[PDB]
Symmetry: C4
Subunit: 221 residues, 4 copies
């Protein structure tokens, strides 16, 4: 019977039907946002959702027999697998984080549809030639996060009280968001030389970012 199901799974109908459900489930997910819609067509949509996930677990099961070991060596299938399993976890229990991560299954639209695969693939293939710079950056943040924590955390707990708060804050400074009016001007009211820490930080982190972007421009070319 292997070939009988294999010709189902491999068919255009099968794929088109799945893509059809993605778009349908996607639309219905946005409708579940409205409190109004849910007081009317609430149960309609709730049952519709348990229907789709069933059709998708079957689909994933059918796909696995047809592909066996090849399935679990396909990034796109693994994604499909993990995103459907997330969606499988019971409505209650633990936390509702899982209930929300369910919406991630709309990314199956990238999986099921080629051309989307193409862009995602292109975007991703750029990432390996970045990891050395990313690593450098992460070491850099880690070193300045520790300095900021022990230089400013006592008198500025919310922003630098903790290694994590300092990472967060340093990230924010990197995006240049309120770095002066909101963080460094207030800091200087106690520590007039705080600028000797953040200006060089901003220069480096910006300089790197420019280089990182240049990398992708030159390397893709």
């Amino acid at each position: 019977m292997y070939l009988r199901i294999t010709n189902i799974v491999e068919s255009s109908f099968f794929t088109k039907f799945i893509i059809y459900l993605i778009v349908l489930n996607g639309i219905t997910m946005g409708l579940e946002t409205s409190k109004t819609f849910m007081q009317s067509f609430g149960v309609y949509t709730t049952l519709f959702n348990q229907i789709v996930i069933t059709i998708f677990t079957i689909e994933i099961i059918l796909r696995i027999y047809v592909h066996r070991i090849s399935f679990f060596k396909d990034p796109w299938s693994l994604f499909d697998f993990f995103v459907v399993a997330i969606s499988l976890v019971p409505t209650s229990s633990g936390f509702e984080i899982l209930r929300v991560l369910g919406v991630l299954r709309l990314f199956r639209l990238v999986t099921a549809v080629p051309q989307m695969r193409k862009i995602v693939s292109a975007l991703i293939s750029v990432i390996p030639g970045m990891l050395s710079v990313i690593a450098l950056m992460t070491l850099f943040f880690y070193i300045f996060a520790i300095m900021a924590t022990q230089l400013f955390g006592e008198r500025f707990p919310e922003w630098f009280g903790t290694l994590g708060e300092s990472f967060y804050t340093l990230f924010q400074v990197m995006t240049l968001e309120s770095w002066s009016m909101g963080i460094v001007r207030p800091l200087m009211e106690v520590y007039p030389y705080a600028w000797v820490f953040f200006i060089p930080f901003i220069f480096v982190v910006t300089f790197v970012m420019i280089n990182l972007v240049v990398a992708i421009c030159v390397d893709a070319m």
Copy 2:
């Protein structure tokens, strides 16, 4: 008589006259801004405006006889047509949006003048090789807008109470405007892990923008 008008329309004088009215109408539109100017030369300018639009409907009518089917297959002509038709709708009725969309006819300066067409054309031709990325991005926002709405909308209605509000807020975050001091620091006062949602969002959305620009740099070359 066809050719008699065709030599009018196709002439150098004709175009130069029209461009002359654009610049004249454009200048007059900026003066209609001054409350002072309107209490003096109010009626002067109001009559001048109904005159020009008449001259432009004639022009569009003349252009259509001379070009017929070719006219409505010319992007620039269509623009000219639609931007003049907007301007034709009566002074009152419905809303005053139409009175304002009238000023869009100054983009007729781009139509009437070559060299302008060229740059607009150059800018636009870049857009097809972007739609896959734009599509990816739009799906991306939609998935995160839905997550944010159901994760933050209850306790943060202004920013995430509604799918549209979440789209808006997520857009703002993408521009990096006040994303931390204005949105994510407040959110974390209730949801200490909100940062697990917005930092990866900012990374992805930034990464893409960088790639999108790299695309245009490499692809234009």
Copy 3:
């Protein structure tokens, strides 16, 4: 005697002496910033300044005889000329704007020193192949400035009350500075669809900027 002065003007000493005064005057200008320095060495520096400008008017006069018509066809000489004339206007009278524009003479360091000329020249030569885009942008701003003025100026005078205030505000939105928390969120409290005006504005203006930068990247390459 022409050649006698021409060999003075053309000498290394002459140029080196002038550059020496630039750096000296530049340093002294920063010292004139200190209220403390001026209560001590105030008169020392004040006389020193009238000395230098004299040496520079002579220099410009000497240079003109040696170059005649060629002088006033040299951008760098013209700059040198106009920046020294600004500096010549009496200490009082009219406004003190002139007293401040004097510091612009430190840009003579770019003039007098080659290599600086080289970078400035390189930076400038890029500008012609931008003017079509700049023109487009300026028309664009002008059209949206007028729309914003008549859509938001009544209820938001500070930001859109006037064509100029609208230009200013639209510029600010373009830099993405507080565009949402500071301008468009407040606007939406009265005009819930204000977002239909500013989001498309931001997209266009950003898109253009990206293209403009791409232009310089591809064209220099």
Copy 4:
């Protein structure tokens, strides 16, 4: 005995041991951040730290005998030397800046590990072909800092009262952070034409940054 130590120092074990201590010290530096961890394992970590720095002074001393004059002509060795010497200065005395600059020794991970050297080297080699532009920029800030100080410092001391304050504020404006809502809108309430100073400043400074990046894009290619 020279060669006896040279085979120690030059060995694979030796380097691997040192990198092992870097990562160990780095990890331990991040734990010294926790107030909790220090009341427990406080002395454990404090002793561990004086141990490592000893091991590193030995290492630097061993490396110097093996390399002599070549050592102090190696950028990476010099860094190693200076970053370890910082770490040597006694726990108290003067200020605690030295205690903090100690954490800079984690950049030893860049020294000790190849591939890291490569990226740092790649990033740095880009800097020479920038110094002309940096120089132009520095002159530029200096001229405008002086203008801003004497135009705005009297009525706006916090932001422009002093040449250094003006440098700081002008830097912030360059990052575009709150330049309008936070600095130029307030300034205009007293000086309605302040915009004639900051808009052209923002244009020039932005233009240059764009060019500077274009330089690195074209020049790296």
